[PDB]
Amino acid sequence: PIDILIAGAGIGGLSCALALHQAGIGKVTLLESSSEIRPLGVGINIQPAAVEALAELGLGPALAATAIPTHELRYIDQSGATVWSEPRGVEAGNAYPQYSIHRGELQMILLAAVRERLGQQAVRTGLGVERIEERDGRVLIGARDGHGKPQALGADVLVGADGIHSAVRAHLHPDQRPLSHGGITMWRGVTEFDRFLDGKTMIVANDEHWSRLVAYPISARHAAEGKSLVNWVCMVPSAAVGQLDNEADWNRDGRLEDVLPFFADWDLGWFDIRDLLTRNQLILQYPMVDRDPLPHWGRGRITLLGDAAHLMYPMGANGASQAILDGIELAAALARNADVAAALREYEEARRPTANKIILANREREKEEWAAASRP
Numbered sequence: 001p002i003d004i005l006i007a008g009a010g011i012g013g014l015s016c017a018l019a020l021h022q023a024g025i026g027k028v029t030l031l032e033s034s035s036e037i038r039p040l041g042v043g044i045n046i047q048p049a050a051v052e053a054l055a056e057l058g059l060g061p062a063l064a065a066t067a068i069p070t071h072e073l074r075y076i077d078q079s080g081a082t083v084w085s086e087p088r089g090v091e092a093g094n095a096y097p098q099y100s101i102h103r104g105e106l107q108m109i110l111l112a113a114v115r116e117r118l119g120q121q122a123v124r125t126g127l128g129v130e131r132i133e134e135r136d137g138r139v140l141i142g143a144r145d146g147h148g149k150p151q152a153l154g155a156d157v158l159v160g161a162d163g164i165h166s167a168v169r170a171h172l173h174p175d176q177r178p179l180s181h182g183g184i185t186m187w188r189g190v191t192e193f194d195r196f197l198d199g200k201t202m203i204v205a206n207d208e209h210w211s212r213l214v215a216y217p218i219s220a221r222h223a224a225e226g227k228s229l230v231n232w233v234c235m236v237p238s239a240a241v242g243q244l245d246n247e248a249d250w251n252r253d254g255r256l257e258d259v260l261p262f263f264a265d266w267d268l269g270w271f272d273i274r275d276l277l278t279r280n281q282l283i284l285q286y287p288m289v290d291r292d293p294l295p296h297w298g299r300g301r302i303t304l305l306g307d308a309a310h311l312m313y314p315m316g317a318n319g320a321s322q323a324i325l326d327g328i329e330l331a332a333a334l335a336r337n338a339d340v341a342a343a344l345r346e347y348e349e350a351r352r353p354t355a356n357k358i359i360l361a362n363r364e365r366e367k368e369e370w371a372a373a374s375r376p
């Protein structure tokens with residue numbers, strides 16, 4: 001009968017709690033520094049294998065009623081023509097859809113599942129992990145609550161699912177490099193459309209200056225009303241931009257005036273990028289950052305999961321897909337081995353080398369495309 005503390009109730013944390021629960025793992029509590037839990041963020045992509053996991057955990061219909069089953073990816077040239085096209089999700093041969101979904105809508109689905117299945121008490125909101133120590137088979141936590149009081153908690157396992165600015169990671173890896181800048185500035189947003197193609201096709205494009213665009217629908221609710229909520233991502237070399245901010249924060253409001261100049265010359269014909277940016281309901285900015293590959297994640301009875309373990313550039317199958325798949329492996333590891341520290345090790349030896357493969361390949365692809373863009 002082990003008691004598990006999870007720092008962070010983001011996508012990785014909630015989903016892990018669910019995997020643990022399904023695997024029959026017992027007492028799980030999670031600690032979230034935010035006072036209340038909010039549907040923040042913009043569109044994200046859930047790859048088929050992670051949707052498979054979420055469906056296995058009984059989330060299939062909640063996803064089906066929220067997210068878009070993206071069936072197609074088109075890359076279009078600067079005149080609007082489809083150059084490359086590919087199937088996605090079931091049509092591409094996967095047993096499950098890829099789901100394009102609003103992050104905060106996904107978080108709410110996860111939060112409700114956890115609340116229903118292990119009681120409202122499982123999610124301790126307003127409680128950020130600050131101090132950590134492993135002492136005699138037991139993890140001992142200093143936390144601080146809403147309106148400032150310190151709190152002491154203990155557990156058999158501590159799972160650091162606490163995102164980009166992970167305190168558990170910082171405890172475990174005090175010699176870590178700062179966030180690594182990939183050299184690309186991103187703006188993110190949502191715009192309302194009546195129709196955007198068939199409502200389930202992802203669009204990609206780029207400049208001769210390597211300004212890239214990604215736009216895809218993310219809302220089943222809108223589609224069921226005739227409408228389309230189109231998520232968009234604008235990616236611009238930071239060498240073009242200069243320093244937009246001293247911060248890397250998932251909720252940083254961006255400026256129409258910073259991003260538009262880069263897209264203003266576009267004439268796609270069928271798709272109006274100026275209109276897309278101009279009618280945003282939200283612009284956020286974010287510098288494309290990751291962290292260096294670690295040779296190890298955890299130590300003793302403390303491990304790492306999600307962005308805390310392996311922050312990657314937010315594209316494709318990175319992010320939530322990897323965090324959900326981490327949780328599956330951790331629950332399975334913990335279920336299989338009675339000796340907790342060996343289970344925790346067995347979990348990351350499954351997940352770390354893959355995560356490090358992706359980090360290094362992403363950097364290299366990015367590097368190569370930038371070098372190519374830079375020649376005259």
Ligand SMILES: Cc1cc2nc3c(=O)[nH]c(=O)nc-3n(C[C@H](O)[C@H](O)[C@H](O)COP(=O)(O)OP(=O)(O)OC[C@H]3O[C@@H](n4cnc5c(N)ncnc54)[C@H](O)[C@@H]3O)c2cc1C
Pocket residue numbers: 007008009010011012013031032033034040041042043044103127128129130161162163164165166167188250251305306307308314319320321323
């Ligand atoms: C508000 C917000 C908006 C986001 N928007 C997007 C987006 O638009 N696009 C995208 O790709 N990704 C977004 N992300 C990141 C995305 O959720 C993750 O990259 C990915 O899905 C894996 O999530 P994760 O659980 O590892 O980290 P996260 O989802 O970032 O979860 C980390 C959680 O831990 C909490 N936390 C941090 N420190 C502590 C601590 N000291 N103690 C306890 N809790 C702590 C954070 O508040 C957060 O809730 C967003 C994250 C957040 C928090």
